[PDB]
């Protein structure tokens, strides 16, 4: 079966930079019938390009498509920031029809440290048996943090899981939080919780913290 | 104006069925070959099966095949999706996508660009029963302060957040849910706010969960010592 594989899987680029998007195919796709798609966050996927080459009605020129055989190019000139969204590549030259796992293209602006935030978990969460602790970052970029908890200055391995939010519509920053989840019991047991934020916009790690069960 | 809005997505368990249905206005939906595509969380497209003008050639991926029937009715404009036999896999936004080629007829299912695309209608198949999420304070304390919700437990998605039944937007994340290693699904929401307002100011999350019809609205404030 055709598969296609896009590359690069992120592209970071600044408004009016070019983008250039790879797809590669495991056969030739007959036809240059190659299309391509935008799809942003919550919304059905648009039609940019089809026959590798052709303008969909109403698309912008800054788009372009080029290729055939197996080997073929989607082209943003110069990159706006609606532009953001996943970029999927499809084939209809052999059934069944298939698409790319999409490349992701995210806007590029200066750096931008968080500011962090720490929650105990609320006397109510854990009257049933289930302590969650929540790290705030807030309106940082690039994406990439490091956040580590420390319990009792004990560093935590496995027992959080992580959400970051899309790029934001008007600033381009994301925001992610960390909870790390105990049981009651072992919550209790402790004094001393923490997240330690490592980001490219800090020059040194920031730690929030607080004593469990103090002011 | 052209619409094409589907319908008939739910929870289901393994091995039960379900009937989408999408309803087209603005074009001449008995001049199009048809297809439903389906996007599995946080994963890309793929073409589920795909229906000619006449809805006499059709055509499926092999995944689905014996399982899942597509079919038209042109007088009502209409296109269906019956899913028996519905498997965890299944589980998928799908679409409902009228192709780009006007039909050139000689009764074949071909094409293959969608340039018009519906909304989408969820569909989960699983054995996990709907529940509801609790919903726990994110209390501020110590010029920004932060305060948030904690909604946890709950299946299946989705789950919205607003703050102050909509009039508090700004500053405002509500994080995307992450799945639990006991299958249920948990997410905060938070708002960032000047220090200053928390004396002065009210703030109440409203937690909608719509599979359990639970609403819920918990107002977070400051804690004390």
């Known amino acids: 079966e055709i598969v296609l594989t896009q590359s690069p899987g992120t592209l970071s680029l600044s408004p009016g930079e070019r983008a250039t998007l790879s797809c590669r195919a495991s056969?030739?796709?007959?036809?240059?019938?190659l299309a391509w798609y935008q799809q942003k966050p919550g919304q059905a996927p648009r039609l940019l390009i089809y026959?590798?080459?052709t303008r969909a009605t109403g698309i912008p020129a800054r788009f372009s498509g080029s290729g055939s055989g197996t080997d073929f190019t989607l082209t943003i000139s110069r990159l706006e920031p609606e532009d953001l969204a996943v970029y999927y590549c499809?084939?209809?030259?052999?059934?069944?029809?298939?698409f790319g796992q999409g490349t992701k293209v995210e806007i590029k602006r200066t750096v931008a440290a968080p500011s962090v935030f720490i929650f105990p978990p609320s006397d109510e969460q854990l009257k049933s048996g289930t302590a969650s602790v929540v790290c705030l970052l807030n309106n940082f970029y690039p994406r990439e943090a490091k956040v580590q908890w420390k319990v009792d200055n004990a560093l935590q391995s496995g027992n959080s899981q992580e959400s970051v939010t899309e790029q934001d519509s008007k600033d381009s920053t994301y925001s992610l939080s960390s909870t790390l989840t105990l049981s009651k019991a072992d919550y209790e047991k402790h004094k001393v919780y923490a997240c330690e934020v490592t980001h490219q916009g800090l020059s040194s790690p920031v730690t929030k913290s607080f004593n469990r069960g103090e002011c | 104006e052209v619409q094409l809005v589907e319908s008939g997505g739910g929870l289901v368990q393994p091995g039960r069925s379900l009937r989408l249905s999408c309803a087209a206005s603005?074009?001449?939906?008995?001049?199009?070959?048809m297809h439903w595509v389906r996007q599995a969380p946080g994963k890309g497209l793929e073409w589920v099966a795909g229906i000619n003008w006449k809805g006499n050639f059709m055509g499926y991926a092999d995944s689905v095949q014996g399982r899942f029937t597509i079919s038209r009715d042109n007088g009502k404009n209409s296109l269906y999706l019956q899913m028996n036999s519905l498997r965890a896999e299944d589980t998928a936004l799908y679409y409902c996508?009228?192709?780009?080629?006007?039909?050139?007829?000689?009764?074949?299912?071909?094409?293959?660009?969608?340039?018009?695309w519906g909304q989408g209608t969820m569909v989960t198949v699983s054995s996990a029963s709907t529940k509801g999420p609790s919903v726990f304070p994110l209390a501020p304390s110590s010029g920004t302060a932060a305060l948030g919700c904690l909604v946890k437990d709950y299946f299946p998605e989705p789950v919205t957040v607003s703050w102050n039944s909509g009039a508090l937007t700004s500053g405002v994340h509500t994080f995307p849910a992450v799945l639990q290693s006991s299958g249920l699904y948990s997410l905060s929401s938070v708002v960032t706010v000047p220090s200053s307002s928390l004396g002065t100011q009210t703030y109440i999350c409203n937690v909608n969960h719509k599979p359990s019809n639970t609403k819920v609205d918990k107002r977070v404030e400051p804690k004390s010592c």
């Open positions: 499809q084939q209809y030259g052999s059934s069944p029809w298939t």
């Open positions: 056969q030739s796709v007959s036809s240059s019938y």
């Open positions: 996508a009228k192709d780009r080629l006007e039909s050139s007829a000689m009764d074949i299912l071909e094409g293959g660009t969608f340039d018009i």
């Open positions: 603005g074009f001449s939906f008995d001049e199009y070959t």
């Open positions: 026959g590798a080459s």
